[PDB]
Amino acid sequence: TVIKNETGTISISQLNKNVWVHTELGAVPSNGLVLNTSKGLVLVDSSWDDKLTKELIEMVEKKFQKRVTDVIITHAHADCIGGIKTLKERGIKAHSTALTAELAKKNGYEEPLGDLQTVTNLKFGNMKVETFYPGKGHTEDNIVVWLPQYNILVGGCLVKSTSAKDLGNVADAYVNEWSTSIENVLKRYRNINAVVPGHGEVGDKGLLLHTLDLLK
């Protein structure tokens, strides 16, 4: 099941019952998650900017007939925190680590909550979510999201997709530490099913090994 906007720059597809993957084109595609809970919609990352972000929010609210209550910002880059202004004026809580919050202000973005610690467990209705800071990699502040009831890992931009041969923007990256950070994710979650990369299609733990390979 896949739903798109008239333009084709925004799509939302179902992973399973309450988990969907949203993708926006900026033409570079960017992934995020949409969690349908008994108490509102929770998103993992926003979109490139405020127009795409408002538009994404509008679609999911229309489809599920619920409000987006929270959003998890994985790092301080446009494809993740691009629509923080949109989120704040709609009363949407933008969760982020303290580091991500200061880096956002540093990049001229409105500041997220800065409430997430190294390991944080959030539960929205019946939907369990865990955020984990593995260390520096793609950016200094990048975190991953884990859904223990489905064993789905949102590696975000710390993980590259299967056909990706480029690590992307490393001007802000910590290439050398990146590998150790992926290892921490691997040691922390032993039984991973699906992993969502920041760009590209959903895969498995093989995506993390693939990324470590690119990093060698």
Ligand SMILES: [Zn+2]
């Ligand atoms: Zn990034």
